[PDB]
Design a protein around this ligand. Sequence first.
Ligand SMILES: Nc1ncnc2c1ncn2[C@@H]1O[C@H](COP(=O)(O)O)[C@@H](OP(=O)(O)O)[C@H]1O
Ligand SMILES: O=[N+]([O-])c1ccc(O)cc1
Ligand SMILES: O=[N+]([O-])c1ccc(O)cc1
Length: 289
Amino acid sequence: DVFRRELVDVEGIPLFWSIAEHWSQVESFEARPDDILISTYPKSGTTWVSEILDLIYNNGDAEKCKRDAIYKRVPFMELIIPGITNGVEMLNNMPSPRIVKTHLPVQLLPSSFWKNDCKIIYVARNAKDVVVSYYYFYQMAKIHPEPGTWEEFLEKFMAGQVSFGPWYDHVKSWWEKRKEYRILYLFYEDMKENPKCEIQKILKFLEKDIPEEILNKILYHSSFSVMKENPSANYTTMMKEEMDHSVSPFMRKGISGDWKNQFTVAQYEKFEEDYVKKMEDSTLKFRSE
Ligand SMILES: Nc1ncnc2c1ncn2[C@@H]1O[C@H](COP(=O)(O)O)[C@@H](OP(=O)(O)O)[C@H]1O
Ligand SMILES: O=[N+]([O-])c1ccc(O)cc1
Ligand SMILES: O=[N+]([O-])c1ccc(O)cc1
């Protein structure tokens, strides 16, 4: 049974057992100079930005972006599961320009990305909305260990005892890295408030100038209401054994501020006190609504 196993430490970070088992394959991954790396802590808008990028690469052509599921169009690099998937091999066999997905903390990223000076798009999301999203995802996505109760999961998240480690360190270190490498550091909340502005930021970063009409096509097809019903983007092509959408759909709510529905007032106060301590010596700023 490849599912519901305990996580395994990889260079200080809890990762899926099968990633740990094939870690040298991940470490030695060969990047290319024109790779675009989408890098996120889980549940921060990875799929959203991946679809945006594939739409940009295909000039807003919805049908071309339905050539395969998002997880094949934009391979999850480090995800290797025997008998199921191998992100490294998928990417190895993919023609340039490649769009690459990762959740790896900066210190675990394969060094080839740095050596190739790749452009990176990092997406961050407010911690409270992340942990709620991750809770329901743990329930539906069976590769994860059992999340337990909301209360138990919240404590694990605060302690960084979840897949890919602590959110706090993930966002902070990737933020610091923007001074060393070409990292467009985006916020889920900004994409909610003004998706046009954020997609324009992506286009400028990619050194692409496109017609307003194409920009509008990309905006339309990357909206939550469109993506949630799109079988090429909504993960419903996954086997039920891997992801059970009847437990919780991947495209769950797609809002900012769902944390209010999940956190008790006491949990919120405790979380905030802990958060300020972990984040006060970083210039990184978030919005929660
Ligand atoms: N087009 C879109 N607009 C807004 N949110 C989106 C989106 N596509 C996916 N999401 C949300 O992004 C989260 C998944 O992130 P990731 O792709 O990094 O795993 C989920 O959040 P919720 O669980 O809060 O709904 C999902 O609903
Ligand atoms: O099988 N799975 O659970 C998967 C496979 C590929 C992917 O990128 C994400 C999850
Ligand atoms: O475990 N999983 O199946 C996952 C985990 C993270 C992710 O972004 C996609 C799929």
